[PDB]
């Protein structure tokens, strides 16, 4: 199990000896024999190394270019360039898992990644290695974006090969040239539309533990592709949704403000203002039904893993909770109960707070909202823990001192909380003995929480703003990208034809001889240097 | 409106003064209101002359940058919070603070260190009243107001080195005029 | 004109052939692609072959175009917008570290 299935050829290549591997490969030792040992697998809970479960991948992952070329274009035994292991990882899949984005590794993997593809072209012109999937159904392009391997993902998206007969493998062509200007095209295949795993969908719908998820959207084809979708059709729909939500919240506010004050609902219909008020209540209920169904629809379509629901996409939970409050309000109202007012005011406050969702769609407001979220997650929780400890301890001491009215724990906690908002009495009661004890306790509480802890929070906030300011423009762009993908699936949902990016254009010739047509996206660049 | 907004302000004060005269000669008491607006605007217009002194001019440029960068966003978020919580509180209140204007002013006092937290008792469901007020206080006072001070400090750091050049541009326009 | 193509390819011998042939150097290509046209992609060079060499760092061609004997280009020629060669040189610059030199 630890080293089961290991062959002699594994040892020779690992020692990086050209003559030693030449002997065994010539001898007819199996090159397709796989060592399915857990030491060679991922096994995140144990130390080890992963290389692809195949001797052919071992040379590629160890920078053995000469051995790799020997293993394939020889005559005695030609290794299977398309062989898949138990997990299904091809040699191209194993090359992605080896990379770790560090400064030196990227130059190694991408350079080796290019030559193994070119060799496959000269050997198997009809075979396309990039579209092979493992047991999970991930192509090497899809797995690179999924695992946060930004260095290799950039190479794949804009791969431009100058050599004839390998130009058809490229993804970033060139239309024409000018003096400082050159026009380039992009493949844009399986990026925005795909059978199972689009590149955009994989990046956006991650579990937030991907190391460079914010940064993978800054590569050249992806950044302008999303901006094109926004400026074309998505932006106008987003403004329409903001306007309708504003109108819904104003009608809800007006209907609750004019509620009758008689007893035992439901209330009878008279005058003409009751017909206008009942109309407003019908619209408020219908709005809460719509947000209730959009909440379970989201869960069924995405299936969050209970960790990407509170750290990411917490706005869906808040809209769903507001809908739940509205439904509870209706249920209580039709049961002759007065608590429907309490449920309705909670619903009103939550609905007005939910308006902050739409700060995305404006750059400055969106960056401001991201900063607010960061400070809430970094500073407020720690401040609250220490503050609650101090408040509870000193309140219990003060209330134990008091004798026969503030002789309640709730009353004394509220008196001490007023010091935080600039309204502390400092003489609120006199029903005690030992007046010196009362003053010493209150003065110690004031110095610790007001002069020290509250002023310290302002200083700690300033340090957070300094460190997160530069990157915050990229978190906002990730938030807006999720909005763009959600709108596309929901609104159109029947043709998916008016929103298509790019256009069919001719870029080259198939190596067989056919004409290859790809949906290309035009990008313009200017270079006054390097004439 | 982005440049030369001082011309607009001096012109607006002149308009207020002319309206004051027109109302005065028509036997109307609102001339006092127009005249007090004119007085306040005229005293505020004195800040035009901070150009012509280097330190005061740089200070004025910094004030303008802060107003254009932080206050507008702060006001949008603050008004959203204030209006929502005020509507909820006033809907809870029963038969005097049973007005939207009265309840908005009570909640605004928390921002200036004057919040009552027990300003009314004409309600049922006392637990609902205190939960709503405590949530509003934590969001706007402890969090949003202290955050504005931290965001101002970042603006000062970035624009301090360059502000001596904006002042010299403003004084150059004065020289040509 | 044909002279526009030869200079754009930055071939000193090729432009020498056409300039010798008597092709008009004062012919202006008033195309929107060659204009500013901020709402569309393109490039501006001055609407004149003489300015084209100047904006493309073709010093040898510029000297050839002016102090030769066959056809001397008009150093004071103005296009439809009125931009002289000196005017076109200003709009080419973009303040970047290398362009200014
Ligand atoms: C009292 C009721 C009626 C209205 C209050 C609205 C409150 C609950 C809304 C306003 C802003 C919201 C918070 C905004 C951001 C975050 C950080 C996030 O990662 C977890 C959710 C959390 C913590 C939200 C929880 C609920 C919240 C506080
Ligand atoms: C209430 C009346 C009587 C007196 C108030 C005086 C006020 C309006 C003066 C004092 C400072 C002034 C502001 C100073 C700077 C700016 C930024 C500028 O780019 C737009 C104008 C604007 C926003 C001014 C508008 C009016 C202003 C607020
Ligand atoms: C914390 C911010 C102010 C916030 N608060 C909310 C409160 C709610 O009750 C519901 C939803 C939201 C909400 O979406 N955001 C938010 C988050 C990120 C971006 C970005 N980019 C824009 C807005
Ligand atoms: C914001 C500053 C304080 C200001 N406020 C004004 C208010 C008014 O009501 C009218 C005019 C002004 C006004 O000019 N400035 C201003 C602007 C730039 C410089 C510079 N350098 C000096 C002064």
From Swiss-Prot, chain B:
Positions of Na(+) 1 binding: 113
Positions on the Cytoplasmic side per record topology: 51-53
Extracellular side: 27-29, 122-125
Binding site for resiniferatoxin: 5-6, 44, 51
Record: residues binding Na(+) 2: 113
Region (AD) location: 154-177
PTM annotation, UniProt: Phosphorylation by CAMKII seems to regulate binding to vanilloids. Phosphorylated and modulated by PRKCE, PRKCM and probably PRKCZ. Dephosphorylation by calcineurin seems to lead to receptor desensitization and phosphorylation by CAMKII recovers activity.
Motif position, Selectivity filter: 113-116
Disulfide bonds: none
Result, substituting residue 44 to A: Abolishes response to inhibitor SB-366791
Purpose: Non-selective calcium permeant cation channel involved in detection of noxious chemical and thermal stimuli. Seems to mediate proton influx and may be involved in intracellular acidosis in nociceptive neurons. Involved in mediation of inflammatory pain and hyperalgesia. Sensitized by a phosphatidylinositol second messenger system activated by receptor tyrosine kinases, which involves PKC isozymes and PCL. Activated by vanilloids, like capsaicin, and temperatures higher than 42 degrees Celsius.
Note: Responses evoked by low pH and heat, and capsaicin can be antagonized by capsazepine.
Family: Belongs to the transient receptor (TC 1.A.4) family. TrpV subfamily. TRPV1 sub-subfamily.
Assembly behavior: Homotetramer. Interacts with PIRT. Interacts with TRPV3 and may also form a heteromeric channel with TRPV3. Interacts with CALM, PRKCM and CSK. Interacts with PRKCG and NTRK1, probably by forming a trimeric complex. Interacts with the Scolopendra mutilans RhTx toxin. Interacts with TMEM100. Interacts with PACS2.
Protein name, entry field: Transient receptor potential cation channel subfamily V member 1
Gene (UniProt): TRPV1
Section of the entire sequence shown: 507 to 708 of 839
Curated annotation (Swiss-Prot), chain C:
PTM characteristics: Phosphorylation by CAMKII seems to regulate binding to vanilloids. Phosphorylated and modulated by PRKCE, PRKCM and probably PRKCZ. Dephosphorylation by calcineurin seems to lead to receptor desensitization and phosphorylation by CAMKII recovers activity.
Residues where ATP binds: 8-9
Positions of ANK repeats: 1-26, 47-74
Localisation per UniProt entry: Postsynaptic cell membrane; Cell projection, Dendritic spine membrane; Cell membrane
Tissue-by-tissue expression: Widely expressed at low levels. Expression is elevated in dorsal root ganglia. In skin, expressed in cutaneous sensory nerve fibers, mast cells, epidermal keratinocytes, dermal blood vessels, the inner root sheet and the infundibulum of hair follicles, differentiated sebocytes, sweat gland ducts, and the secretory portion of eccrine sweat glands (at protein level).
Family according to the record: Belongs to the transient receptor (TC 1.A.4) family. TrpV subfamily. TRPV1 sub-subfamily.
Entry domain remark: The association domain (AD) is necessary for self-association.
Subunit structure, interactors included: Homotetramer. Interacts with PIRT. Interacts with TRPV3 and may also form a heteromeric channel with TRPV3. Interacts with CALM, PRKCM and CSK. Interacts with PRKCG and NTRK1, probably by forming a trimeric complex. Interacts with the Scolopendra mutilans RhTx toxin. Interacts with TMEM100. Interacts with PACS2.
Role noted for this protein: Non-selective calcium permeant cation channel involved in detection of noxious chemical and thermal stimuli. Seems to mediate proton influx and may be involved in intracellular acidosis in nociceptive neurons. Involved in mediation of inflammatory pain and hyperalgesia. Sensitized by a phosphatidylinositol second messenger system activated by receptor tyrosine kinases, which involves PKC isozymes and PCL. Activated by vanilloids, like capsaicin, and temperatures higher than 42 degrees Celsius.
Misc note: Responses evoked by low pH and heat, and capsaicin can be antagonized by capsazepine.
Designated name of the protein: Transient receptor potential cation channel subfamily V member 1
Residue range from the parent sequence: 204 to 304 of 839
């Amino acid at each position: 199990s630890y080293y089961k299935g290991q062959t002699a050829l594994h040892i020779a290549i690992e020692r990086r000896n050209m003559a030693l591997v030449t002997l065994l490969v010539e001898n007819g030792a199996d090159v397709q024999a796989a060592a399915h040992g857990d030491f060679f697998k991922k096994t995140k809970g144990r130390p080890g190394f992963y290389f692809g479960e195949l001797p052919l991948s071992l040379a590629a992952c160890t920078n053995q270019l000469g051995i790799v070329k020997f293993l394939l274009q020889n005559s005695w035994q030609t290794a299977d360039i398309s062989a898949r292991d138990s997990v299904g990882n091809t040699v191209l899949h194993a090359l992605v898992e080896v990379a770790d984005n560090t400064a030196d590794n990227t130059k190694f993997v991408t350079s080796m990644y290019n030559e193994i593809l070119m060799l496959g072209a000269k050997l198997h012109p009809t075979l396309k290695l990039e579209e092979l999937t493992n047991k999970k159904g991930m192509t090497p392009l899809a797995l690179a974006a999924g695992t946060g391997k930004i260095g290799v993902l950039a190479y794949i998206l804009q791969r431009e090969i100058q050599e004839p007969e390998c130009r058809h493998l490229s993804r970033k062509f060139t239309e024409w040239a000018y003096g400082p200007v050159h026009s380039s095209l992009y493949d844009l295949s399986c990026i925005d539309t795909c059978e199972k795993n689009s590149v955009l969908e994989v990046i956006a719908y991650s579990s937030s533990e991907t190391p460079n998820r914010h940064d993978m959207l800054l590569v050249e084809p992806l950044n302008r592709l999303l901006q094109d979708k926004w400026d074309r059709f998505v932006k106008r729909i987003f403004y329409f949704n903001f306007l309708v939500y504003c109108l819904y919240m104003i009608i809800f506010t007006m209907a609750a403000y004019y509620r009758p004050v008689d007893g035992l609902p439901p209330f009878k219909m008279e005058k003409t203002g009751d017909y206008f008020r009942v109309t407003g209540e019908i619209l408020s209920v219908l709005g809460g039904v719509y947000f209730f169904f959009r909440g379970i629809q989201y869960f069924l379509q995405r299936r969050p893993s209970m960790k990407t629901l509170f750290v990411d996409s917490y706005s869906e939970m808040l809209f769903f909770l507001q809908s739940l409050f509205m439904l509870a309000t209706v249920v209580l109202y039709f049961s002759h109960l007065k608590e429907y007012v309490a449920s309705m005011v909670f619903s009103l406050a939550l609905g007005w707070t939910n308006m902050l969702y739409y700060t995305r769609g404006f750059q400055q407001m969106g960056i401001y909202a991201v900063m607010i979220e960061k400070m809430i997650l970094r500073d407020l929780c720690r401040f609250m823990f220490v503050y609650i400890v101090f408040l509870f301890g000193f309140s219990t001491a003060v209330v134990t001192l008091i004798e026969d009215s503030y002789n309640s724990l709730y009353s004394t906690c509220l008196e001490l909380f007023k010091f935080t908002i600039g309204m502390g009495d400092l003489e609120f009661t006199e029903n005690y003995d030992f007046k010196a004890v009362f003053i010493i306790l209150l003065l110690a509480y004031v110095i610790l929480t007001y002069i020290l802890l509250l002023n310290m929070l302002i200083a700690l906030m300033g340090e957070t703003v300094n460190k997160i300011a530069q990157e915050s423009k990229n978190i906002w762009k990730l938030q807006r990208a999720i909005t763009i993908l959600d709108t596309e699936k929901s609104f159109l949902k029947c043709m998916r034809k008016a929103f298509r990016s790019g256009k069919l254009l001719q870029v080259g010739y198939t190596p067989d001889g056919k004409d290859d047509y790809r949906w290309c996206f035009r990008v313009d660049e200017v270079n006054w240097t390097t004439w």
